[PDB]
Ligand SMILES: *[C@@H]1O[C@H](CO[C@@H]2O[C@@H](C)[C@@H](O)[C@@H](O)[C@@H]2O)[C@@H](O[C@@H]2O[C@H](CO)[C@@H](O[C@@H]3O[C@H](CO[C@@H]4O[C@H](CO)[C@@H](O)[C@H](O)[C@@H]4O[C@@H]4O[C@H](CO)[C@@H](O[C@@H]5O[C@H](CO)[C@H](O)[C@H](O)[C@H]5O)[C@H](O)[C@H]4NC(C)=O)[C@@H](O)[C@H](O[C@@H]4O[C@H](CO)[C@@H](O)[C@H](O)[C@@H]4O[C@@H]4O[C@H](CO)[C@@H](O)[C@H](O)[C@H]4NC(C)=O)[C@@H]3O)[C@H](O)[C@H]2NC(C)=O)[C@H](O)[C@H]1NC(C)=O
């Protein structure tokens with residue numbers, strides 16, 4: 210052995226930005242022994258102990274240790290407000306409890322600029338065309354970009370991960386591919402962007418023929 | 419112990435596409451023991467044994483095994499022609515020699531389309547502007563994208579890794595950032611792209627005010 214290790218993970222960006230999703234912080238304890246398998250978790254939100262976390266059943270691993278996980282749902286507004294979530298792990302194999310703390314990225318937020326680009330000339334002779342959504346100058350990097358048309362999700366797009374720019378902000382592109390048909394008939398397509406620094410955390414940019 | 423393991427690595431895309439660079443295949447042998455440290459390499463180019471590989475001095479590792487590496491330079495035209503490079507590793511701890519073979523990606527090549535985009539409206543009021551180079555529909559993914567102006571490299575750009583598209587081809591974008599000055603005075607900037615499927619393996623797209 211050697212004592213357990215603790216890793217603390219943030220919620221997913223899309224869960225923090227959507228009212229219908231459940232953002233969670235996850236405190237993962239590994240190298241928990243057969244002899245001392247009991248793990249106690251204490252959770253604090255800016256120092257105030259909360260009691261509504263849920264510990265998953267211990268999971269035996271291939272190397273003969275346990276993985277013990279505790280999951281705390283965070284209020285969407287608390288995460289966005291920069292509250293700090295501390296997981297304290299107690300176990301009889303540890304010399305003292307281990308604490309980890311996480312919170313949203315801390316720099317000044319910066320709102321994305323969003324532009325849509327119509328299909329490149331070479332594609333007007335093909336069966337499918339691509340529309341582009343350029344999203345740049347945002348911070349932090351947490352963001353969600355989708356496409357829709359007639360209020361339905363389009364699913365055929367691919368978005369780069371955010372890329373760190375020299376000025377400390379991020380940029381990305383998303384590319385939607387649609388049947389040329391749909392474009393030539395004047396259907397309106399929109400790039401949706403959800404990011405904390407936008408007004409109302411959301412913006413859309415629309416285009417058509 | 420358990421016997422040595424072999425990993426074979428391709429040359430870098432930029433080395434294969436530039437006449438002044440040295441593309442190499444690298445045969446890496448790990449978990450070589452103190453007792454049987456001697457490693458013999460045989461190399462073959464489409465079955466023909468070649469004798470100009472160079473074995474690096476054995477390198478002792480932190481876990482008390484050796485890492486032994488052999489490096490074979492490949493002719494630029496041979497790699498592009500799809501020749502297969504086989505590394506055969508013999509060592510007294512192995513039941514039989516181990517062989518690995520690698521070659522360029524095998525699908526049909528497909529030439530990139532390249533477009534440059536001038537600065538977004540929001541930036542005309544800033545100190546720096548970004549120019550964009552969109553490169554799409556290429557295959558294989560090996561490619562090199564740079565920027566220049568007045569025949570000198572511009573170094574302030576960032577290029578995404580190739581992204582796999584639904585149609586089996588790749589796309590990427592490169593973004594150069596320059597002082598607004600330079601753009602407003604009419605300097606010409608160009609996106610260079612080197613890819614095997616372009617005519618003469620190279621193309622440039624240029625833009626200015
Ligand atoms: C016995 O086995 C145990 C189990 O191992 C597995 O079993 C076998 C089969 C074998 O295959 C193993 O390889 C298997 O993993 C071993 O446990 C492992 O221990 C090691 C450490 O020793 C852990 O390593 C750490 O890994 C994290 C990476 O976090 C994960 O991603 C990995 C790899 O992709 C994945 O395996 C993990 O499970 C984690 O996945 C994430 O899980 C979270 C939580 O569940 C997901 O988030 C949640 O998802 C939900 C939806 O699913 C909701 O959205 C919810 O809201 C959300 O919270 C998340 O999606 C998921 N991610 C992915 C990709 O799946 C590394 O980050 C960690 O990093 C390092 O820390 C190091 C110290 O170890 C340091 O060296 C490194 O540089 C690095 O970075 C620094 O770390 C510091 C912390 O010390 C940081 O402070 C610092 O900021 C940071 N620096 C920088 C610059 O960033 C480390 O590598 C590994 O996770 C354990 N595996 C598991 C499954 O738990 C055990 O080791 C072994 N024991 C023995 C004795 O052999």
Ligand SMILES: *[C@@H]1O[C@H](CO[C@@H]2O[C@@H](C)[C@@H](O)[C@@H](O)[C@@H]2O)[C@@H](O[C@@H]2O[C@H](CO)[C@@H](O[C@@H]3O[C@H](CO[C@@H]4O[C@H](CO)[C@@H](O)[C@H](O)[C@@H]4O[C@@H]4O[C@H](CO)[C@@H](O[C@@H]5O[C@H](CO)[C@H](O)[C@H](O)[C@H]5O)[C@H](O)[C@H]4NC(C)=O)[C@@H](O)[C@H](O[C@@H]4O[C@H](CO)[C@@H](O)[C@H](O)[C@@H]4O[C@@H]4O[C@H](CO)[C@@H](O)[C@H](O)[C@H]4NC(C)=O)[C@@H]3O)[C@H](O)[C@H]2NC(C)=O)[C@H](O)[C@H]1NC(C)=O
Pocket residue numbers: 423425427428429430433441442443444446448449479480481483485
């Ligand atoms: C004792 O120690 C040894 C040394 O370990 C280090 O020491 C300590 C300090 C500790 O920190 C270790 O963690 C250290 O690494 C151990 O050796 C390691 O063994 C493991 C396997 O057990 C190796 O793991 C493999 O790793 C490759 C990844 O290849 C590397 O990238 C890694 C990580 O980024 C890097 O560490 C390596 O050095 C390799 O780097 C590349 O090196 C090449 C060659 O030098 C560079 O190319 C050259 O570069 C030149 C310029 O520099 C020129 O350009 C030249 O032209 C060019 O050729 C290259 O740039 C560089 N890349 C990077 C990023 O640096 C994995 O690919 C490999 O993959 C897997 O294979 C698995 C089986 O193991 C399989 O499970 C996986 O899924 C995976 O994928 C599949 O693999 C199949 C092969 O089996 C493939 O057929 C299949 O296609 C593929 N599938 C798919 C879908 O893709 C595997 O993980 C590791 O490389 C070794 N480390 C080193 C340094 O050599 C040793 O294990 C340990 N022993 C014991 C008993 O403990």
